[PDB]
Amino acid sequence: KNKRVLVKFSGEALAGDNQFGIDIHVLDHIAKEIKSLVENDIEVGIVIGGGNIIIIRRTSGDYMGMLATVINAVAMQEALEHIGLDTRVQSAIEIKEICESYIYRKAIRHLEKGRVVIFGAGTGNPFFTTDTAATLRAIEIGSDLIIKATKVDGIYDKDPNKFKDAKKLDTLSYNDALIGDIEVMDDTAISLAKDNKLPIVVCNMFKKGNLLQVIKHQQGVFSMVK
Amino acid sequence: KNKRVLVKFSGEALAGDNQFGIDIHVLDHIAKEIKSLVENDIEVGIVIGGGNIIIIRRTSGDYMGMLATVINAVAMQEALEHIGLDTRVQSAIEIKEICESYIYRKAIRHLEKGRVVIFGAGTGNPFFTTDTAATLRAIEIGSDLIIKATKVDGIYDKDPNKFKDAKKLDTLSYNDALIGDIEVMDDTAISLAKDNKLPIVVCNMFKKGNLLQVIKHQQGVFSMVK
Numbered sequence: 001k002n003k004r005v006l007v008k009f010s011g012e013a014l015a016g017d018n019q020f021g022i023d024i025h026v027l028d029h030i031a032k033e034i035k036s037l038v039e040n041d042i043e044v045g046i047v048i049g050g051g052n053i054i055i056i057r058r059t060s061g062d063y064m065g066m067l068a069t070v071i072n073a074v075a076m077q078e079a080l081e082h083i084g085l086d087t088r089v090q091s092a093i094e095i096k097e098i099c100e101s102y103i104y105r106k107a108i109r110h111l112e113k114g115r116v117v118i119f120g121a122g123t124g125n126p127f128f129t130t131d132t133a134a135t136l137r138a139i140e141i142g143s144d145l146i147i148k149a150t151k152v153d154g155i156y157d158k159d160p161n162k163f164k165d166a167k168k169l170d171t172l173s174y175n176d177a178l179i180g181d182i183e184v185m186d187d188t189a190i191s192l193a194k195d196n197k198l199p200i201v202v203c204n205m206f207k208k209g210n211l212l213q214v215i216k217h218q219q220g221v222f223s224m225v226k
Numbered sequence: 227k228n229k230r231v232l233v234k235f236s237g238e239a240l241a242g243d244n245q246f247g248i249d250i251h252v253l254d255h256i257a258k259e260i261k262s263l264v265e266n267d268i269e270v271g272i273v274i275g276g277g278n279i280i281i282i283r284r285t286s287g288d289y290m291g292m293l294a295t296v297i298n299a300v301a302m303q304e305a306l307e308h309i310g311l312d313t314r315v316q317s318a319i320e321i322k323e324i325c326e327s328y329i330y331r332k333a334i335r336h337l338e339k340g341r342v343v344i345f346g347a348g349t350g351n352p353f354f355t356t357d358t359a360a361t362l363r364a365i366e367i368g369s370d371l372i373i374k375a376t377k378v379d380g381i382y383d384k385d386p387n388k389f390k391d392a393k394k395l396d397t398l399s400y401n402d403a404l405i406g407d408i409e410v411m412d413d414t415a416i417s418l419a420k421d422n423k424l425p426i427v428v429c430n431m432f433k434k435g436n437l438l439q440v441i442k443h444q445q446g447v448f449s450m451v452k
């Protein structure tokens with residue numbers, strides 16, 4: 001059981017080829033990766049963004065986004081339970097009919113008993129990015145690391161798309177990320193991780209077995225900030 | 227102020243051309259129609275569906291749908307307040323950071339003071355349709371009628387999506403709606419309207435001034451059940 005991880009996905013990751021909605025096939029693929037972790041006695045928390053769903057002001061937009069993250073968390077819970085994984089959803093905003101509220105002592109108990117816990121509604125506050133919410137939750141549950149799953153193999157010195165001469169950095173420091181043209185997460189997220197010495201792994205979610213390799217073996221394909 | 231109405235939109239109505247999401251322009255058009263009612267001392271409650279946003283089992287799907295109606299209600303609130311209309315959102319499920327909870331004595335007060343009240347999360351219960359939720363809220367607030375705003379001009383003897391010979395029925399009885407194969411609302415909704423003698427009007431959201439004509443003048447284009 002010992003190993004404990006927080007896996008963060010963007011909402012867009014659930015949409016598939018399309019720009020919006022939930023692709024049940026993407027969801028099912030994600031569920032199987034998480035199952036590989038659970039079956040290996042790795043304890044798993046999950047944070048999902050809302051970008052696949054979300055005149056309109058910043059604060060309102062952010063609250064709508066938080067609701068979207070809960071819709072995604074519920075859809076994910078269904079996908080995981082569908083393949084026999086015991087799953088709990090805890091929201092930073094109380095929505096009692098639909099999911100549990102975030103309660104520290106309950107989250108820890110869930111993880112100790114081998115449930116996957118999905119955190120919705122971020123920190124429950126607008127203006128904080130999904131990355132920051134995920135980093136906060138990772139630290140709160142005593143995670144060994146946070147994995148930011150992205151469409152890309154890892155962290156590059158310049159966008160890989162253009163120019164195509166961009167190079168993958170296997171490892172870098174919190175300061176490399178904070179003071180650099182290279183975005184890993186926003187500054188607030190990086191700072192929070194830095195000040196709690198939370199290692200950040202960036203990798204591609206959809207390489208089969210990759211999460212398991214990163215967590216259990218410190219292998220696979222990834223970049224790490226620490 | 228005397229006149230009080232509940233206006234119900236499907237979620238899909240907010241998506242406009244696309245089948246997913248929220249078309250801000252459609253929202254603005256809707257806001258302007260509501261404004262004409264408010265400026266004419268008509269008290270307005272609104273219910274919106276979630277179909278523009280929403281392995282997954284029925285109960286989970288319905289809860290996701292309810293969250294979608296709240297996202298829509300917030301967007302709608304933004305659109306109405308953008309044009310100066312005091313607007314309140316009340317949810318059947320408490321989501322306190324984002325909107326108010328449904329509270330009868332509060333809803334009545336809001337309406338008496340000329341606020342538009344948008345009801346989110348339906349009845350807070352799965353298996354009840356948006357039409358049923360809307361009929362419920364309509365009766366609870368003492369509405370003179372419920373208006374089901376649709377893409378079509380009114381109620382047809384047969385589907386216009388099928389029937390170049392399909393004719394618009396100007397008036398129907400509750401029994402006509404219940405017994406017939408004509409689509410007005412689901413049986414549960416019709417039964418609840420019938421048992422509380424709530425008149426039902428079906429009409430086309432899009433045509434400017436139509437809501438005002440229906441409510442203030444008993445004119446415009448529409449079908450009625452009573």
Ligand SMILES: Nc1nc2c(ncn2[C@@H]2O[C@H](COP(=O)(O)OP(=O)(O)OP(=O)(O)O)[C@@H](O)[C@H]2O)c(=O)[nH]1
Nearest residue numbers: 087088089095096097098099100101109110113115
């Ligand atoms: N929607 C919703 N579900 C809840 C809430 N509290 C508990 N549940 C669900 O009800 C089921 C039973 O809950 P519990 O009695 O706390 O048992 P448990 O979650 O398995 O507890 P652990 O064994 O410690 O992991 C679980 O699926 C919970 O996720 C809640 O406040 N809202």
Ligand SMILES: Nc1nc2c(ncn2[C@@H]2O[C@H](COP(=O)(O)OP(=O)(O)OP(=O)(O)O)[C@@H](O)[C@H]2O)c(=O)[nH]1
Nearest residue numbers: 313314315321322323324325326327335336339341
């Ligand atoms: N998100 C959220 N907003 C609330 C809640 N309660 C009140 N508000 C909002 O805070 C603002 C002030 O609310 P109130 O002090 O109740 O005054 P009011 O809404 O104007 O009340 P009326 O004059 O009776 O219509 C309004 O925009 C309310 O919608 C709540 O529980 N959650």
